Design a protein around this nucleic acid. Sequence first.
RNA 1: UAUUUAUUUU
Length: 174
Amino acid sequence: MDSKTNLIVNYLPQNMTQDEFKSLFGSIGDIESCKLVRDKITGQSLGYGFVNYSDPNDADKAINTLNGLKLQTKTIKVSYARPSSASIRDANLYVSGLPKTMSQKEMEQLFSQYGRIITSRILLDQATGVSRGVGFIRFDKRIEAEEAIKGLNGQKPLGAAEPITVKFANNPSQ
RNA sequence: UAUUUAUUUU
C-alpha cells in the first residue's frame, strides 16, 4: 500500500496551467506523474496540485527546493498530502480582533483544543506586506471548525468595535 | 478590507 508519494503543491498561480506546472517541476527528477484538484461540477478551481514520484528520497529532496518558491505573484509549497483524514478539504477560518503581539501558538493551542488544526496563524506585517491584525485557523474537519466557530465567535453590535470575531472566510474585495 | 488568496485531487 502506498500514498506517501502524494506530494501536494499548494498555492498554485491561477494564471498558470497544468502543463506548465508539470513542465516546471520537470527539471527536478523522475516524475512518475502529477495531479491537480480540478472540479467537474462548477469548474471554479482552488489552487493546488500534486507530484507523484517513484521513491520518497527524490520526493523529499525536491521539497527542500520546492518548500518555498516565491514568484512575482505568489509562493509555491509542496507537502505530504495525507491519504485521507475522513472529509478534510478546506477548513480555513477567519479570526479578527487580535492585538499586534498575537502569538500564533496561542491561537494554535486555543483552536487545537477544539480540533487538531492543520495550520493556524495571524496576518500582520509592516515591511514585506501590510498591517492587518487578524488570525486564521486551517482545521482538518470543516464541521469541527464550524462547530468550533459556533462556540468561539462572539458578536459585533453597534455599541462596540470588534468583540472577538472568528468565522469562515467571507470575501476580501470580490 | 481577513492569511502566500483556496494543503487535501478524471
